[PDB]
Amino acid sequence: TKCTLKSFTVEKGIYQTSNFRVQPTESIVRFPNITNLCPFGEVFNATRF
Amino acid sequence: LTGTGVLTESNKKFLPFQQFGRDIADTTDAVRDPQTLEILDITPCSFGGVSVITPGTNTSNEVAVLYQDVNCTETWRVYSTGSNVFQTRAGCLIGAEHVNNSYECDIPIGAGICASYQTSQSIIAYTMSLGAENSVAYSNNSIAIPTNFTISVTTEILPVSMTKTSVDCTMYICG
Amino acid sequence: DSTECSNLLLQYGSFCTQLNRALTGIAVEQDKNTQEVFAQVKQIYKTPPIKDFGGFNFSQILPDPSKPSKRSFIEDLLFNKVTLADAGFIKQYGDCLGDIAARDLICAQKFNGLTVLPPLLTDEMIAQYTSALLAGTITSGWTFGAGAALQIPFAMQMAYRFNGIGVTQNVLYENQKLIANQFNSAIGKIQDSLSSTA
Amino acid sequence: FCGKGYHLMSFPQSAPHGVVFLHVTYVPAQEKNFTTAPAICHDGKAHFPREGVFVSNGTHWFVTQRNFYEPQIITTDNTFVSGNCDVVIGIVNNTVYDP
Ligand SMILES: *[C@@H]1O[C@H](CO)[C@@H](O[C@@H]2O[C@H](CO)[C@@H](O)[C@H](O)[C@H]2NC(C)=O)[C@H](O)[C@H]1NC(C)=O
Numbered sequence: 001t002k003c004t005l006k007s008f009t010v011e012k013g014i015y016q017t018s019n020f021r022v023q024p025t026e027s028i029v030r031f032p033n034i035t036n037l038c039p040f041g042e043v044f045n046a047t048r049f
Numbered sequence: 050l051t052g053t054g055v056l057t058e059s060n061k062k063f064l065p066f067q068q069f070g071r072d073i074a075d076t077t078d079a080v081r082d083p084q085t086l087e088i089l090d091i092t093p094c095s096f097g098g099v100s101v102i103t104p105g106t107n108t109s110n111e112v113a114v115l116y117q118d119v120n121c122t123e124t125w126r127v128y129s130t131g132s133n134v135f136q137t138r139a140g141c142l143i144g145a146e147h148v149n150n151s152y153e154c155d156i157p158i159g160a161g162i163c164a165s166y167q168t169s170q171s172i173i174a175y176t177m178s179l180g181a182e183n184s185v186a187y188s189n190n191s192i193a194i195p196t197n198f199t200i201s202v203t204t205e206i207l208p209v210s211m212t213k214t215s216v217d218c219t220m221y222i223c224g
Numbered sequence: 225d226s227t228e229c230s231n232l233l234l235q236y237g238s239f240c241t242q243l244n245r246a247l248t249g250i251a252v253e254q255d256k257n258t259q260e261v262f263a264q265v266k267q268i269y270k271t272p273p274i275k276d277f278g279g280f281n282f283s284q285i286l287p288d289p290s291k292p293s294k295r296s297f298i299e300d301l302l303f304n305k306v307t308l309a310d311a312g313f314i315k316q317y318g319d320c321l322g323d324i325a326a327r328d329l330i331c332a333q334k335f336n337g338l339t340v341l342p343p344l345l346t347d348e349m350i351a352q353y354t355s356a357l358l359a360g361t362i363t364s365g366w367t368f369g370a371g372a373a374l375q376i377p378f379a380m381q382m383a384y385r386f387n388g389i390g391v392t393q394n395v396l397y398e399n400q401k402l403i404a405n406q407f408n409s410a411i412g413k414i415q416d417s418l419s420s421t422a
Numbered sequence: 423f424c425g426k427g428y429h430l431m432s433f434p435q436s437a438p439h440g441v442v443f444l445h446v447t448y449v450p451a452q453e454k455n456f457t458t459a460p461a462i463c464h465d466g467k468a469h470f471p472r473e474g475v476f477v478s479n480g481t482h483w484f485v486t487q488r489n490f491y492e493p494q495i496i497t498t499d500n501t502f503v504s505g506n507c508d509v510v511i512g513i514v515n516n517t518v519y520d521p
């Protein structure tokens with residue numbers, strides 16, 4: 001609140017602060033289970049374009 | 050110079066070094082034909098307000114269209130012509146039939162015209178009735194004195210409060 | 225008249241819907257204001273053909289029949305002193321066509337999407353409401369605003385008013401002609417102030 | 423301001439985000455045509471009514487309050503005199519009972 005008012009003194013009253021945040025703990029990734037590698041050779045390393 | 054509009058002859062006189070012409074806004078209101086060296090006036094083709102008169106659509110699906118800036122009394126600039134055409138100071142009204150009677154305003158079309166759903170039901174357009182006619186039996190030697198009274202109770206509703214709100218500006222804008 | 229800009233505006237979003245909501249609210253509010261001010265009486269009272277109002281002359285605030293719109297003499301001056309734009313809400317595409325758009329301001333406002341809607345009440349109908357109010361306050365006094373109109377001679381109405389301002393009703397009767405002359409002169413002075421230049 | 427008619431009293435009632443007033447008013451209902459006069463000559467002197475109005479039921483004259491027909495006899499205690507009656511307009515001759 002003091003930062004919001006840009007002052008070090010808050011007069012008596014009630015003030016509205018930021019809504020309740022919860023910071024995430026984990027960081028997940030979900031990609032399809034694919035093991036094959038893209039045909040880089042056939043597209044970039046192929047004769048007879 | 051691309052664009053879209055109507056082209057007509059103009060009384061404007063363009064100097065040799067002038068090709069296009071502009072208006073109070075920045076908009077090409079005139080142009081010179083390179084092949085014929087004649088002036089032309091560009092006018093936008095879209096012009097005129099359109100208002101739709103409809104009931105709740107839970108009661109009937111037919112509507113009436115009011116075309117402002119159209120005088121049918123004079124290929125009118127209308128989407129679709131209809132059998133029932135009524136001319137009003139607001140504009141041409143299509144889809145509503147004029148009735149010579151006067152009722153209270155149900156749908157405020159315009160100047161003094163109000164529509165309603167009535168009667169095989171159909172949409173009607175009528176001149177609004179200000180109220181019942183009356184005359185006071187005035188005379189220099191006549192007065193009216195009540196002999197009885199009525200106690201009437203009337204309700205007056207007045208808003209006093211409005212919903213209080215608060216916004217977290219870093220949760221709406223950013224999240 | 226651009227398809228590309230319109231298809232971009234569809235993406236930019238719908239703020240024009242709320243703009244139009246606000247403007248429609250304003251227009252309906254104007255109609256409501258007119259109704260609230262003038263439509264205070266539903267019974268339309270006609271002035272009696274006989275005009276024996278104790279010497280008072282209301283021929284300059286009451287309607288004059290010999291006009292297309294039944295309007296008074298001190299309302300025609302007011303109308304002629306306020307100059308509306310074109311005094312009409314029908315400007316056909318033909319009239320605006322032919323290099324009259326850049327000249328006429330209304331045509332420019334109207335080729336660019338801006339329109340002026342007509343009010344729900346015509347000037348003649350507002351004048352009818354006012355004439356009803358004048359007839360009621362003349363013939364009946366303040367009774368028509370409390371219910372059914374009750375006729376009363378105008379002199380006695382003015383006597384009641386004098387009693388209201390703490391003056392005995394005898395003063396009016398003993399000085400009726402003087403008061404009527406003062407009132408008529410004062411109502412002519414309003415005409416002079418309005419029919420003159422100011 | 424407080425309902426239609428002569429205001430007697432009002433009763434507040436609460437509504438969501440607003441208030442409701444029940445305006446009790448006094449509305450006269452039944453009116454009767456009468457014949458009236460601003461004053462009356464009794465002995466060459468004009469009589470005016472104090473808090474009232476003169477009316478005639480025909481052959482007889484009375485005085486009553488404006489907002490309700492409560493006819494009464496015309497008396498000196500019910501009227502006040504002011505000068506002769508060569509200046510008033512519409513005055514009518516009649517007797518003023520002296521209690
Ligand atoms: C009320 O006033 C108007 C004008 O102030 C009077 O109209 C005049 O009438 C006489 C004829 O009686 C004409 O000669 C005048 O030219 C009129 N003046 C106007 C129209 O401005 C009217 O007569 C008055 N009413 C009464 C009952 O006397």
Ligand SMILES: *[C@@H]1O[C@H](CO)[C@@H](O[C@@H]2O[C@H](CO)[C@@H](O)[C@H](O)[C@H]2NC(C)=O)[C@H](O)[C@H]1NC(C)=O
Binds near residue numbers: 402405406
């Ligand atoms: C009270 O005022 C009135 C006017 O407001 C006076 O009446 C005027 O009297 C003069 C002469 O004194 C006349 O020339 C005017 O024509 C009168 N005017 C009107 C409208 O009648 C009056 O004299 C004043 N005195 C009394 C006692 O009434």
Ligand SMILES: *[C@@H]1O[C@H](CO)[C@@H](O[C@@H]2O[C@H](CO)[C@@H](O)[C@H](O)[C@H]2NC(C)=O)[C@H](O)[C@H]1NC(C)=O
Binds near residue numbers: 463465466
């Ligand atoms: C009301 O009474 C007055 C007198 O108080 C009457 O007026 C007088 O009438 C007599 C008879 O005609 C005359 O001789 C007097 O000169 C009058 N005096 C005045 C001051 O006017 C009057 O006529 C009576 N009203 C009626 C209707 O009879």
Ligand SMILES: *[C@@H]1O[C@H](CO)[C@@H](O[C@@H]2O[C@H](CO)[C@@H](O)[C@H](O)[C@H]2NC(C)=O)[C@H](O)[C@H]1NC(C)=O
Binds near residue numbers: 481
């Ligand atoms: C007007 O009122 C008078 C009263 O002042 C009426 O005359 C009275 O009528 C009643 C009813 O019959 C009698 O009892 C009285 O004796 C009458 N008066 C006198 C003085 O005797 C009169 O009838 C009324 N007229 C109308 C048309 O209502």
Ligand SMILES: CCCCCCCCCCCCCCCCCC(=O)O
Binds near residue numbers: 038039
């Ligand atoms: C051969 C087909 C692969 C297609 C995969 C989908 C596209 C994903 C982006 C791949 C871009 C690779 C471009 C080369 C990367 C830069 C190499 C370099 O700079 O030496």
Ligand SMILES: *[C@@H]1O[C@H](CO)[C@@H](O)[C@H](O)[C@H]1NC(C)=O
Binds near residue numbers: 041045046
């Ligand atoms: C593919 O790449 C290898 C080395 O990365 C190269 O020796 C070979 O010639 C390439 N294939 C073709 C068809 O050129």
Ligand SMILES: *[C@@H]1O[C@H](CO)[C@@H](O)[C@H](O)[C@H]1NC(C)=O
Binds near residue numbers: 083084085086
């Ligand atoms: C060619 O254009 C000129 C104007 O620049 C015009 O005078 C002439 O008639 C045109 N000729 C043809 C064949 O269109």
Ligand SMILES: *[C@@H]1O[C@H](CO)[C@@H](O)[C@H](O)[C@H]1NC(C)=O
Binds near residue numbers: 107108
């Ligand atoms: C409005 O729609 C509901 C649901 O279909 C229906 O029950 C109701 O009768 C409708 N009202 C009118 C006036 O048609």
Ligand SMILES: *[C@@H]1O[C@H](CO)[C@@H](O)[C@H](O)[C@H]1NC(C)=O
Binds near residue numbers: 121122123137138314
């Ligand atoms: C419509 O045009 C007719 C002539 O065709 C004219 O008499 C009438 O006054 C016009 N009405 C309006 C409202 O412009």
Ligand SMILES: *[C@@H]1O[C@H](CO)[C@@H](O)[C@H](O)[C@H]1NC(C)=O
Binds near residue numbers: 149
């Ligand atoms: C209604 O009025 C029009 C003229 O405005 C007239 O032609 C028509 O006959 C009238 N109809 C009725 C039923 O009064």
Ligand SMILES: *[C@@H]1O[C@H](CO)[C@@H](O)[C@H](O)[C@H]1NC(C)=O
Binds near residue numbers: 186453454455
């Ligand atoms: C008074 O008399 C007139 C006709 O003289 C009549 O039209 C009117 O209805 C009467 N008023 C009352 C309240 O009876």
Ligand SMILES: *[C@@H]1O[C@H](CO)[C@@H](O)[C@H](O)[C@H]1NC(C)=O
Binds near residue numbers: 189190276512513
């Ligand atoms: C009332 O007017 C009539 C004419 O309608 C007239 O004969 C009578 O003398 C007038 N009376 C008063 C008091 O003005």
